[PDB]
């Protein structure tokens, strides 16, 4: 919380989420979202049978695709974006051990936590916006503002600083489960696999001095904090 | 037996019960097997973070506008100059974009009153160093040029370097305990009709316009260093103040521009290919 | 939701927040969101009935950006002005809802012919207006309110008005609000779950009828979407205040 | 015909929605 | 009724029975069998009454397989949809019923000429519709309100439509519901056995009317059936969720 | 009360000729409707007959398998139940690794079976229409589907049973047998949303008339 | 234990058990091998991370490949044989939520039970041998006799009476930890996913009466009764 004077190495004073068999640290601060609840008591009703949890599987940081914020990027304008869990099933981080139980299990209920790891010079500055939507399928080109960003569940990125934002994510859906894998032999009256949409959005542009770099990367990490699976099956490859 | 009843009493006939408010009682029939039953709130309900008020709608932090700081604006300069009503954004010219959660909840109440908060976010470094005045204006309005009028009101001068942030609660100064909307009560005009002075002169109200101001002036000069950018962004935030206050319920100022479908019937209006 | 308070790291000095003007022109306080939406709409504005369909459909679900009037597309029975309350407004930024609805129902006639109101539960489509339900060309004999559905009757002559509370008949947990678009062909079981049911309308003789809607007692909303992108042009249809 | 109906394939995924790769759409 | 729990002699380890979904979305429970036949059922949608007639009869039974519709045979004033009711699938389990039942009559008019209602007891005939008793051309000197049995009255203008509540005046300890075959030319005193009796309807001048009915509060059914052979199509006239 | 009540669904056979794997029975388990590709006639059982008064159903169904054998007959059948995906016909290890129950068939001739649960909604909504007012068997067009009162969510929840051991009976017995299944709603069954019914009486049917007015005296 | 009189559903007094999301009943009586013990101890230190368990994954019971015996086949005669773990991942039921953790650990400890139901008429007779044979890498074809088979853990079946078997297999092997699986980038030097051989020999050939069956059949199940897992790694189809 308070730096301290230049030791060999440097200001060593870095914290470390440590969850499972995955250690982060961060060098600045940390933003967090508020820490909300989920729809309960119609899982016990949903479900006759009980409902199993993997957290050495699940509950690990897994890291995703990079996103490539440049000075040529006006605000309200998408970065990247993430339907979940379907992206982190079969778009990003294939081989992942958190998707494990996506293949034999049908139904589930998922609250997931969200790091995001900036990496700009001192001589840059910029804000980027991360923000969830709940049960976002047929709503995604509405609401999907910066603005909106600001009102919905959000953490905040500045460039220069390098500080860290970790977004919480309530399970918030229509129906009591929601459905993992698409097959053949199911059903096309549903959309599968997408309770919640992330977006990731310039709300200032990146702006750099003479002759500097044009460009600047950020990561973000994935865990999920309560992962309940229901209605096991016969297990089947992803997408 | 069967003896007579002489009881009676005197009843003024009404066609629906309590028709206009939004509380008190009701004469509704439920359509259910049990006439007193009702939705069971035991497991799904209304989170605990959710507005329960519009005044809590109110409370959340919209980005308002943006302006640039360079180093070539000579000490003086209005970086930043708006009338700060939540009424409307411009009384000359038609709005597009994405109004804030404060102005949205606003234009849907004809009076207003109570303080306004502003967050003056400044997208730099370190190695930035400058300094501005905030000043909120009433009645009476400043020159562009003379920076001494705008010095003699209620200001926060604010010293730009490690903290990026300065918070400004505008406080509420104004003749009557609440200001009447700019926006009009009630505009049937749907298909952008081309207006005329007899349009004008068959208004709902007047237009009574805001003279009160937030400008944002140059104190001491932005003096980056040659490693970093010349000019910076900065992002002005607003909200409503804690004891902000909306009443007389109107038909909408603003309403959804972007991606606007009317419904139709599905699957008959040719769903089938 | 989120205020947007994590981000207020500035501690310095301020000026007063003075007091509250709340309850100060009267109590009646306007605030509430659970007040506004109680509040009844108006939908259809002297629409016409007909002996000859199977009566007209009228969607359970609350007024909104899907009930809205765009500029120069097709015109449909609903009113235009439906876009712009503030009961839409509210139903905008929220796109879960549960609980009771309440339909208002106004025939214009004072004759001894009864009009029925049939509740269908959630039964997947979504249709409004008149409709021949799968063609036929004689309900007279096999009336809608006549299968048994829970079903009520206005009298014109007693009393012209009905005020009725549609229960939340549905399998979901929320009943969803809106869509990015309404006309749009995907998946057919999503699309449903934007209605918990239909009200149905069927006369003896042809008629006009108005219908008000509002959120019941129990209700509540929930899934905040924060704020769309708009557009305004209020300032145009009125006269300053300086001439 | 009505152009609402289906979103060209260039934007949309197979579920006839927005793709997620697709970021020009705002 | 039998479980058919004799049966189950199995004692193996079973998957859980989880919890109940009962008073989940609303506490409004329409499961009891005594709450749907307390339900309202239609029976004469806008059927014509005569002065020229001795009245309307009204044969006093629960809605049930004897008042239903089949493809091409001959045509009643009956509606076709009674059939296939849940009121009348209930009552197709049980051949007894017991108690009083609830008819509502809604006449298609506002004027000061009088509706009059007559509960007959339970005579032994079963006659519906209009009816020339003992075939006389004349009934404005005599009527069959008049004769001096138990009497209600409808007077439009003032509100057009009764609930009267028909008591159960039979010898029998149970009215039967139901018989293999209506139109079948068995011994007479059990061929009566089957209505409690009836209503009659006379008007002044020629109008419309409506007919529902329920049970009572005080009403009880036994002697369960267990269900009939049936036939379904209702896959048929319906989208799958899969276009 | 009433779809607590025990009523035979259907039945099929097991011969010694049946290899290993296959699918003896094979349905689509919904009470909503038999079938969703044909006419269907016959005696519904009562948990079946009550359902299709309800829009809405919820809660386990209970199933119960008695196998008209003796003594002499010996075999194996696997009970599974599947969700949202379904296995192939001829890979058996697929329905292996869903919720199953393992019959030992032999002195014992019956198997109760409770089917748990589990489904995306606290209710599913019934298959059957709401409102269904062609009476006269017309002759059904696409105009006449596009105007239906609700969209079929058709069911992909089956249960199917297969060979484990290949049924060895004794010269002196029959070489097939048949098998009763039987089903009732479990004991947290619940419905809700009264509709008009799914199913209506088909045999020995005849509208009243006024007796004795209608030529009742020959 | 004690039969009862003839009812509707004949001699009803079957047991059943209820493992996870799968019963098992039989009619007749059971046969148990002893329950003995597995070495344990050496797991804090061959694993420096901590190990996990899937048990509503793992202990569910699993039917795996009909065996078919015939009334030609002589005393000694495999009817059947599975390399364990290796033949349950990639060989029998290949789609079985029981595999899913094996495919993202690398090590593991696995202590299973397997269960075998006969079919067979009454005219019918013989007896069947199951037996298990800890570390049998490169000892497959000695010791591998009826007579060896009577000696190690073992279970045995009449085909008449169609009693049922369950064979309790603790994990006996010379290492700390098995090898799940081989890879491309991985070591020659070690034989992975074997620590255990399940040999089904006849100890008496089948006989029947005239005109009767020349053949009935016995289906294996099995599950672990104690799956530990070690090392995590990214997840890998299964051979």
């Not at chain 2, 919209?62 to 003086?76: A, V």
């Not at chain 2, 962004?233 to 009443?247: D, Q, T």
């Amino acid at each position: 919380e308070v730096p301290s004077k230049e030791s060999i190495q440097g200001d060593a004073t870095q914290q470390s989420s440590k969850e499972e068999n995955t250690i982060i640290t961060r060098d600045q601060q940390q933003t967090v979202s508020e820490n909300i609840p989920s729809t309960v008591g119609d899982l016990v009703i949903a479900s006759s049978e009980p409902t199993q949890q993997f957290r050495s599987l699940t509950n690990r940081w897994m890291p995703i695709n990079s996103i490539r914020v440049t000075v040529n990027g006006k605000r309200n304008d998408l970065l990247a974006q993430y339907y979940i869990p379907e992206d982190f099933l079969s778009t990003h981080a294939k081989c992942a051990p958190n998707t494990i139980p996506f293949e034999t299990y049908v139904y589930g209920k998922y609250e997931l936590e969200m790091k995001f790891v900036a990496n700009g010079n001192k001589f840059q500055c910029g804000k980027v916006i991360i923000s969830v939507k709940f049960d976002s399928y047929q709503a995604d080109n509405i609401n999907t503002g910066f603005q909106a960003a600001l009102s919905r569940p959000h953490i905040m990125l500045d460039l220069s600083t390098n500080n860290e934002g970790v977004l919480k994510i309530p399970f918030r859906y229509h129906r009591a489960f929601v459905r993992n894998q698409t097959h053949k032999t199911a059903t096309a009256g549903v959309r599968p696999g997408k309770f919640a949409s992330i977006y990731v959005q310039v709300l200032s542009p990146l702006q750099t001095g003479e002759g500097g770099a044009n460009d600047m990367f950020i990561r973000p990490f994935y865990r999920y904090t309560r992962a309940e699976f229901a209605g096991m099956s016969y297990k089947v490859p992803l997408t | 037996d069967k003896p007579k009843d002489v009881s009676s009493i005197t009843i003024i006939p009404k066609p629906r019960l309590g028709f206009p408010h939004g509380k008190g009682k009701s004469d509704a029939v439920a359509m259910r097997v049990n006439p007193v039953a009702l939705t069971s709130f035991q497991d799904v309900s209304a989170y605990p973070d959710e507005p329960r008020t519009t005044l809590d709608i109110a409370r959340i932090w919209g980005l308002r506008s943006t302006f640039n700081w360079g180093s070539g604006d000579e000490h003086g300069k209005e970086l930043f100059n708006t009338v700060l009503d939540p009424g409307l954004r411009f009384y000359d010219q038609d709005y597009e974009g994405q109004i804030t959660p404060m102005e949205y909840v606003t234009g849907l109440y004809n009076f207003w009153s109570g303080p306004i908060e502003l967050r003056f976010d400044f997208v730099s470094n370190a190695f930035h160093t400058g300094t501005v005045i905030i000043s909120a204006e009433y009645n009476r309005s400043s020159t562009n040029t003379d920076e001494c009028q705008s010095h003699s009101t209620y200001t926060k001068t604010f010293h730009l370097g490690e903290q990026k942030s300065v918070h400004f609660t505008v406080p509420y100064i104004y003749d009557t305990v609440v200001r009447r909307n700019t926006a009009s009560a009630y505009l049937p005009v749907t298909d952008y009709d081309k207006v005329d002075n007899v349009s004008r002169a068959q208004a709902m109200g007047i237009r009574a316009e805001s003279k009160m101001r937030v400008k944002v002036r140059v104190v001491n000069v932005l003096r980056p260093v040659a490693s970093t950018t010349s000019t910076i962004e900065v992002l002005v935030y607003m909200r409503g103040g804690k004891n902000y206050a909306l009443h007389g319920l109107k038909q909408s100022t603003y309403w959804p521009s972007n991606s606007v479908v009317p419904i139709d019937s599905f699957p008959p209006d040719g769903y089938d290919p | 939701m989120d205020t947007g308070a994590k981000e207020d790291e500035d501690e310095t000095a301020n000026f007063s927040d003075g007091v509250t003007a709340m309850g100060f022109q009267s109590l009646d306080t306007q605030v509430s969101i659970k007040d506004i939406l109680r509040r009844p709409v108006l939908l259809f504005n002297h629409v016409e009935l007909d002996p000859d369909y199977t009566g007209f459909f009228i969607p359970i679900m609350p007024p909104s950006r899907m009930m809205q009037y765009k500029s120069g597309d097709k015109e449909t029975s609903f009113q235009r002005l439906i876009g712009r309350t503030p009961q839409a407004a509210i139903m905008n930024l929220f796109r879960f809802w549960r609980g009771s609805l309440r339909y208002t129902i106004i025939i214009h006639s004072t004759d001894g012919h009864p009009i029925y109101v049939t509740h269908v539960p959630h039964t997947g489509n979504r249709v409004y207006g008149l409709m021949k339900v799968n063609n036929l060309h004689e309900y007279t004999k096999v009336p809608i309110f006549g299968c048994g559905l829970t079903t009520e009757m206005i009298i014109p002559s007693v009393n012209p008005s009905i005020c009725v509370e549609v229960p939340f008949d549905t399998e979901n947990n929320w009943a969803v609000t809106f869509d990015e678009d309404a006309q749009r062909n995907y998946s057919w079981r999503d699309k449903g779950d934007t209605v918990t049911g239909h009200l149905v309308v069927t006369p003896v003789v042809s008629v006009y009828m108005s219908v008000w809607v509002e959120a019941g007692d129990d209700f509540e909303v929930s899934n905040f979407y924060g704020p769309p992108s708009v557009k305004t042009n209020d300032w145009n249809y009125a006269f300053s205040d300086e001439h | 015909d009505n152009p609402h109906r289906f979103l060209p394939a260039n934007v949309s995924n197979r579920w006839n929605e927005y793709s997620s790769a697709y970021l020009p759409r705002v």
